[PDB]
Every structure is written in C-alpha cells, then in structure tokens.
C-alpha cells in the first residue's frame, strides 16, 4: 500500500 | 530514578550518578573514595544552599528531570581547612570564542 | 574504578573508568591519569557528558545538545578522541 | 545510460550507507510496524521490492503510516514535483520546511557518534557553501564535506 504527496 | 551530578571544587570536577532516593551523606561517601577526604571534612552545596546529611537528593531538589546525563546538575564542594570549611569556590570553565 | 582527565587549562575531570574506555584514544593511553594539553575545559567537560550520555542511552533517545559556539572545537576533540 | 546519471547514483549509494537511517532491503509490513511504535514524523529510507522503484521512504503521518516511493529521472530525485540532484538534499528539504512531514530519522543505531552530532551542527550554522571559509584543517574540512547536511 503506497501513496504520494 | 537515577540522577546525574557534577561535584565541583576549585579546578576538580567529578562525574557521578546516584539514586534520587539516596542521601547527601551517601554522596559524601563517594567523594571520600575518590578524593581521600572523610565526610566530616566535606560540605556539599546546591547553588548557595548547604545540603543536609539526612536529606535525599530528591528532597534537595535534584530530580531525574532536572539532572540528565547530558546536563548533569552542579554540586558545590568545600573541604575543611583546620577549624572551618573553606569558602565555596568553583573555578569556571573556559568559554568558546565568538562565531566567525 | 575512576580515572582523572586533565584539560589544557588544568581542570581535572574524574569519571568512571568504564566510561572513559568509550574513547579509543583514551583506551590506548591508560594504565590512572591522562593529560590533554590541547583540549580546553569547556570542551572536555562536554565530552565527559557525552560519555555518560552515550553509555546511559545505548539501548527514543533524547537529543544531545551542542551549542554552535563549541561545535568547531568539539569536533576537533571528537575526531582526536575517536568517539 | 544517460551519461553522468551513473556518477550520481553511485555517489548517493555511498552516502546511503554512510547515514544510519537507511535499512536496505526491508519489508513494507515491518517498516510500518516499526514506525507505528515510533513518534509522529519519524521517517526511514529502505529498498523497494518493486522493479521500477529504487528506494522508498516510510514516514508515520498523523493519520497513519505511509510509504512513499522515490523517483529518479534524468539525474534528478523526486518524491512520488520538486526535483533534487541529491537524495539527502531531498530529505533535508522536507525536514526543514514548515510542513514537518519528516522530523527525525529512525537509525539502526539511535545514538550517533559525537563527530556526527558536531558535523550536523557545523553545517546548520555555516552551511555547505561556507564549508571552505572555515578555520579548520583539511582532515576535518573533508569530514564535513563527506556528509554536508543538517539531517
């Protein structure tokens, strides 16, 4: 589970 | 908890630790083994306040929160010169120079 | 038991022998007294605090404070004392 | 390919091993489970099991623990729109900004040597630019340039 900003 | 101290007299500084529940007299016993002076020839000070023998370090204001390993509390030390105890005298450390 | 460390200005610092063995340099030149004719007292006192700081918290560790005015001289001592 | 991009990645990898908070090949689950017990804002750099991703940064935000991938494109490092030449220049940037997404790095050894703590203070007050205006000899000046960051 990865994301950004 | 444990309290970390700096016992200073003239140009001598002793780094040591003790229990917050330990007494000032126990601290004098530590200095006796190091500087070869008996407890009846020693006087320990917090700033200008003379510490009582039967009071614990916590009761004297030395708490683990205010005397950390990286910031040990300063305890003044004076020895007995014949009749009386010499005046408290702690030689200050040097100061760093001004920033370039 | 205890060892005595003397600074350039003649200030005597008495610390536990096990604490002084942290420095590889001090460990190499010790039998009960070591003379540091090139390190001032305000730097050597800060190093002695680091010995207690390093040995106690070697295990969230509180930050070791370093004033900017002593950072240059303290770096020279740390590089020499190997710690 | 790409020319001097090889000279950059090989240089950062040496700095990745120099710093303490690089954990190399690390599972995403253990990275989030390790940081869940750490205070808010504690970040960490580790390898990424993906094929198109060199490194990942795992930070604990106020809401949850997130892992963000790091993109490298034409000699510039970016997080998953600000490009940076060095990876630790990217780390220092997000550490100094008011957003405080990153605050403290979880190092393998939490207690750093006195030389590193002094080095971090030297760079914080003078800067990597003034590193040559310092009255310090070559051995110490080179040590400051070995890892010139406030991190």
Numbering used by the authors:
A (entry chain G): 756 to 760
B (entry chain B): 1 to 100
C (entry chain C): 17 to 47, 58 to 85, 89 to 112
D (entry chain A): 59 to 138, 141 to 211
From the reporting publication:
We have determined its mode-of-action by solving two X-ray crystal structures of SOCS1 bound to its physiological targets (both the ElonginB/C adapter complex and also the JAK1 kinase domain). SOCS1 is shown to be a direct inhibitor of the catalytic activity of JAK1, JAK2 and TYK2 but not JAK3. Our structure reveals that SOCS1 inhibits these three JAK family members by blocking the substrate binding groove on JAK, acting as a pseudosubstrate.
Successful expression and purification was achieved by deleting the first 52 residues, co-expressing SOCS1 with its native ligands, Elongins B and C and including a phosphotyrosine mimetic during purification. We solved the structure of SOCS1 from Xenopus laevis in complex with Elongins B and C. Although the human form of the complex did not crystallise, the SOCS box from xlSOCS1 is 73% identical and 85% similar to the human domain and contains identical Elongin BC and Cullin5 binding motifs. SOCS1 forms a complex with Elongin BC that is structurally similar to other SOCS/Elongin BC complexes. Comparison of the structure of the SOCS box with the same domain from SOCS2 (which targets Cullin5 with 100-fold higher affinity) shows no large-scale structural differences between the two. Overlay of the Cullin5 binding region from SOCS1 and SOCS2 indicates that the IPLN sequence in SOCS1 occupies roughly the same spatial position as the canonical LPφP motif in SOCS2.
